[PDB]
RNA sequence: UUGGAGUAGGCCAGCUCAGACCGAACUCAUUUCCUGCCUUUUACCGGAUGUGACCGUGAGUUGGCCUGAAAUACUCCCUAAUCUUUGGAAACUCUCUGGAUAUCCCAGAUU
């Protein structure tokens, strides 16, 4: 019974369509604009060490 | 030499020179941005030997080697050093 | 069942066989390379035997392209049936089995 | 030949040395396995709980004690003050 | 293949029997041009 | 070694798959190879003349674990981890149709070479499926309690040999939907089930790295075993390694996890060959069906080796 | 539901001007040039050499034959290659 | 009878810089009674048009990699939506 | 009129092919010449000749995402009132012709 569960889980993990390359692939998503705003404000004049 | 050996040597030499042409074309004009996101892993079966004193047989290892993601904006990291020429190949006897 | 090679029974018992090309709502058949087959019950009396042999002898005719009306058709019978893959990206080269581990 | 059984069966003659590896520290060869095999074996070694036989209900029970050890997640419809949504940034008490 | 055509070129007249380069550039016919076609009548009989 | 067979080279590579090659087969004529892989494609190669890749089939949403030529040699049969089967026309290169109804990954599949044409699809929902290759719906399905990783159809066309994770080779009757007898001896999951060319013996390799030959004749003693063969270790991957019989039935070949193909004599038991040359688990080891001493190995280093036996 | 003319009647319309041989159910056989044809198989012919089962060989000019009293026409072989027998892809 | 594209009712969308709004002014005959400078400008725009059409290059184009999509494939570039003034201030400060 | 095989829209990404009108729009570089301006040459002048890049475009195909739809739905090709499909039939006899030939029988034709 536990061998059956392990075999089913292993084969679904290996041969599932959701893991065609070994991992779950998502779409490149859009970040909030305040992230870029904070990055640009933080680095500034590039004067800090 | 007959056409078989001649064409075999032609294939071997033109494969080597084609590799050299590919390297020279890569060096001559870089492809603007030098990144490659097709970073396919390489798996290595590594069997350790005995080292640093102890001689117990360590378990053999499976190692995943992946190329590191590089910043596309990074310039060349190191300067070029002008090292003098090494000595030539050992010269032959002078058969006068 | 278009273009299937078919045999047709006619109203007067004749046969019309060949390569059918078309049909309509009135069951009129366009039938190519047609052979008309006729049967007659002959009483072939041999000079030595007093019993006249009853034989349904068979006679042939060729017509070619024909068009029969559905008001004279009886039955429709089967005669006979009528008389992109791209290459791959793989390569092949000679190779050896390498240096086997000497056991 | 030299891949047949009688060729692999014969040993190397002579005595043995009383006193090889591809790299300086051991022997390393290139191998080909599925990604899922390496991930599953690395997970079995890495995860604290690799092995130790366990079904779904007591795993959910361990998840429940782990969840109640953590801080309150908060209410997402409360935008300010006590009860405001903290979410996955809730820390574990220690 | 005329509908796989873009730009001002898809607004051009086909001009099937104008084949001289003078005919193409001047936009008029300079030579006689024969064709043989199978055309159907109203009753359905094809003629040459 | 002098030349033994009619090949361009005594041994040579076939490559071009971008994933692990899980199953490779032969034409019944013995002139065409069809290989399905992890990369959801099927590559069709020509053995003789210039060794040329001449076809690619792309219809499956997941890994293709099996594919079987028909009795004539114009139809290809794919079992795939997208929970489907498929019949392919190898003249236009199109897919004829898909066979739908399995609720898990299909591991095995077999067609009948004698008699009426059927499809034998074992799958991880514990289900054998008997399919007719003209209707998209299954003729029948036998439900079990354990995932099935290897199936085989008999000469008579009424017996199903099914191996799975229950460590038993079960022999079922199609018209009765019941096991006629179980066959024990293995202690890890059965990966292949091949009937001999004469139909007198059964080969079964499993995940305990032991290949067992069994007496299959109807009037047999209580223990239907014959022999056990060692020397083909299964490595780290738990793949479905599939073996084959030679045409005369004298030799058996099983892929190993060391990149080697281990060939034994079916009647004597000696290790006739241990053939290296692969950098991964050899998923398939097949013999040429047209009386030739040719062995094809398909391995998860994305490659196949065509070799001759000298 | 416009009454589409059948392919046999279309082939009969193609056959006008050619030499056709008609076999009737009233026993007559005519070989002649098909001048006029209708959608209900009434045909007007010109040459009409006549042949019956009782051997009524005769020659005359111009005839109107109704489509109910006929069995079948025979038309030239080349009319097999008419454009109506090529499947227009829709 | 309207000129292109006003005689159409469907079409493909073009780049904003690919719409020459006043090109037909100098593709047509110049209005009567212009200054010499305006007529010379008309003739020079005609010259630019004619040289653009005479040197109309169309050789083979091979596999072209897009710069922005290749940068978007990496982890070092993210995407968002901002005001154009904010983007211009960022570009000017970055270049400085 | 039906069957068989099919399954939406939007967006993202890869791959292959397509300038000929890929693009109803328009730059830059460069080989070999000729001209111009020129103390030198980078940068230039403007014609020819090829040759590259760059800003873009379309189709096919593969994978993914988002919102759904949920065996619904959609889809392709395909198969009783006169000229056929709501029967002028059915049955038998006579005569004639042919074979048999003393007849029976039968084929064809006619009533």
Structure in words:
- This is part of a larger assembly, with eight protein chains of seven kinds.
- Chain A has 49 residues and is an all-alpha fold.
- Chain A has helices spanning 2-15, 33-43.
- Chain C is mainly beta.
- With 48 residues, chain E is low in regular secondary structure.
- Chain E has one helix at residues 21-26, and strands at residues 39-40, 46-47.
- A two-stranded antiparallel sheet of chain E has the order 1-2.
- Strand 1 (42-48) of chain B pairs antiparallel with strand 1 (26-31) of chain D, so a sheet runs across the interface.
- The structure holds one RNA strand of 111 nucleotides.
Protein structure class of chain F? mainly beta
Strand neighbour order, sheet with most strands of chain F: 1-28-27-26
Biggest sheet descriptor of chain F? 4 strands, antiparallel
End-to-end C-alpha gap of chain F? 7 Å
Indicate the radius of gyration of chain F in whole angstroms: 18 Å
What is the makeup of the main sheet of chain E? 2 strands, antiparallel
Number of strands of chain E: 2
Helical content of chain E stands at 10-25%
SS-derived structural category of chain E:
little secondary structure
The percentage helix of chain F is under 10%
Topology of helices and strands:
This is part of a larger assembly, with eight protein chains of seven kinds.
Chain A: H1 2-15, H2 33-43
Chain C: E1 5-10, E2 15-23, E3 29-45, E4 52-68, E5 73-80, E6 91-94
Antiparallel strand pairs in C: 1-2, 1-5, 2-3, 3-4
Chain E: H1 21-26, E1 39-40, E2 46-47
Antiparallel strand pairs in E: 1-2
The structure holds one RNA strand of 111 nucleotides.
Summarize this entry quickly:
Chain C has strands at residues 5-10, 15-23, 29-45, 52-68, 73-80, 91-94.
């Amino acid at each position: 019974a536990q061998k059956k569960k392990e075999w089913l889980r292993m084969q679904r993990n290996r041969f599932g369509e959701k893991r065609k390359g070994g991992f779950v692939e998502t779409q490149k998503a859009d970040m909030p604009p305040e992230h870029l705003r904070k990055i640009v404000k933080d680095i500034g004049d590039v004067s800090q060490k | 030499p007959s056409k078989e050996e001649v064409e075999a040597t032609a294939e071997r030499t033109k494969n080597a020179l084609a590799a050299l042409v590919s390297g020279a074309l890569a060096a001559q004009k870089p492809k603007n941005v030098q990144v490659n996101t097709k970073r396919e892993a390489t798996f290595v079966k590594y069997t350790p030997s005995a080292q640093m004193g102890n001689n117990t047989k360590k378990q053999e290892r499976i190692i995943k080697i992946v190329e590191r993601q590089r910043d596309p904006m990074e310039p060349p990291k190191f300067k070029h050093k002008k090292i003098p020429r090494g000595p030539p190949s050992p010269p032959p006897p002078v058969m006068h | 069942y278009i273009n299937w090679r078919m045999r047709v029974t006619l109203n007067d018992g004749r046969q019309m066989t060949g390569q059918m090309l078309a049909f309509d709502k009135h069951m009129n058949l366009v039938l190519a390379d047609t052979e008309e087959f006729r049967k007659t019950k002959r009483m072939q009396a041999k000079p030595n035997s007093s019993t006249t042999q009853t034989l349904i002898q068979e006679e042939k005719r060729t017509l070619g392209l024909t068009i029969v009306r559905g008001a004279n058709i009886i039955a429709l019978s089967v005669e006979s049936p009528p008389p992109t893959l791209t290459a791959g990206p793989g390569v092949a080269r000679p190779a050896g089995r390498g240096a086997a581990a000497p056991i | 030949v030299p891949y047949t059984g009688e060729n692999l069966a014969r040993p190397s003659y002579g005595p043995a040395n009383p006193f090889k590896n591809n790299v300086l520290t051991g022997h390393a060869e290139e191998m080909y396995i599925s990604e899922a095999t390496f991930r599953a074996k690395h997970r079995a070694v890495e995860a604290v709980g690799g092995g130790v036989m366990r079904s779904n209900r007591e795993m959910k029970e361990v998840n429940k004690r782990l969840r109640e050890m953590r801080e309150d997640k908060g209410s997402a419809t409360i935008a300010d003050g006590e009860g405001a949504y903290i979410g996955p940034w809730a820390r574990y008490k220690r | 293949r005329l509908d796989k055509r873009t730009g001002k070129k898809r607004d051009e007249q086909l001009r099937y029997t104008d084949v001289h380069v003078i005919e193409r550039d001047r936009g008029l016919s300079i030579k006689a041009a024969p064709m043989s076609l199978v055309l159907s009548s109203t009753k359905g009989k094809s003629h040459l | 070694t002098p030349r033994t067979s009619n090949l361009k080279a005594p041994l040579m590579e076939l490559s071009g798959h971008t994933g692990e090659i899980f199953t490779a087969k032969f034409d019944p004529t013995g002139t065409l190879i069809a290989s399905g892989s992890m990369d959801r494609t099927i590559m069709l190669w020509r053995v003789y003349g210039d060794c040329e890749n001449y076809g690619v089939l792309n219809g499956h949403k997941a890994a293709i674990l099996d594919l079987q030529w028909s009795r004539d040699g114009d139809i290809l049969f794919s079992a795939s981890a997208d929970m489907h089967l498929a019949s392919w026309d190898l003249t236009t290169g199109q897919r004829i149709r898909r066979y739908i109804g399995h609720e898990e990954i299909i591991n095995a599949m077999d067609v009948t070479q004698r008699g009426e044409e059927l499809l034998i699809s074992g799958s991880d929902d514990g289900t054998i499926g008997i399919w007719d290759p003209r209707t998209k719906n299954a003729v029948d399905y036998i439900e079990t309690d354990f995932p099935i990783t290897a199936v085989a159809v008999s000469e008579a066309g009424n017996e199903i040999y099914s191996g799975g994770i229950d460590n038993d080779i079960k022999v079922w009757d199609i018209r009765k939907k019941a096991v006629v007898h179980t066959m024990l001896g293995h202690n890890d999951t059965i990966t292949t089930l091949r009937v001999s060319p004469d139909g007198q013996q059964l080969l079964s390799y499993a995940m305990d790295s032991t290949a067992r030959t069994w007496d299959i004749r109807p009037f047999a003693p209580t223990d239907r075993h014959i022999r056990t063969f060692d020397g083909a270790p299964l490595g780290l991957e738990k793949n479905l390694i599939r073996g084959s019989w030679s045409k005369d039935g004298k030799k058996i070949a099983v892929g190993a996890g060391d990149g080697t193909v281990v060939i034994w004599g079916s009647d004597t038991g000696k290790l006739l060959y241990k053939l290296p040359g692969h950098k991964g688990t050899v998923n398939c080891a097949e013999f040429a069906p047209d009386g030739a001493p040719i062995i094809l190995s398909a391995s998860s280093d994305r490659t196949m080796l065509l070799g001759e036996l000298i | 539901m416009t009454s589409s003319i059948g392919i046999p009647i279309k082939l009969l319309n193609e056959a006008q001007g050619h030499i056709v041989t008609l076999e009737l159910t009233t026993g007559q056989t005519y070989r002649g040039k098909l001048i006029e044809a209708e959608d209900n198989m009434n045909v007007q012919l010109k040459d009409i050499t006549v042949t019956a089962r009782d051997g009524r060989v005769s020659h005359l000019e111009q005839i109107y034959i109704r489509g109910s009293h006929v069995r079948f026409f025979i038309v030239p072989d080349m009319l097999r290659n008419a454009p109506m027998f090529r499947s227009r892809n829709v | 009878w309207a000129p292109y594209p006003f005689d159409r009712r469907s079409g493909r969308m073009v780049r904003a810089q690919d719409v020459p709004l006043i090109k037909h002014w100098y593709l047509e005959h110049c209005p009567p009674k212009q200054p010499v400078k305006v007529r010379v400008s008309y003739q020079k725009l005609l010259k630019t048009y004619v040289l653009n059409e005479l040197h109309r290059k169309r050789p083979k184009s091979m596999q072209k990699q897009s710069l922005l999509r290749t940068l978007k494939q990496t982890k070092f570039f993210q995407q968002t939506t901002i005001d154009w003034v904010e983007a211009g201030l960022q570009v000017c400060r970055q270049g400085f």
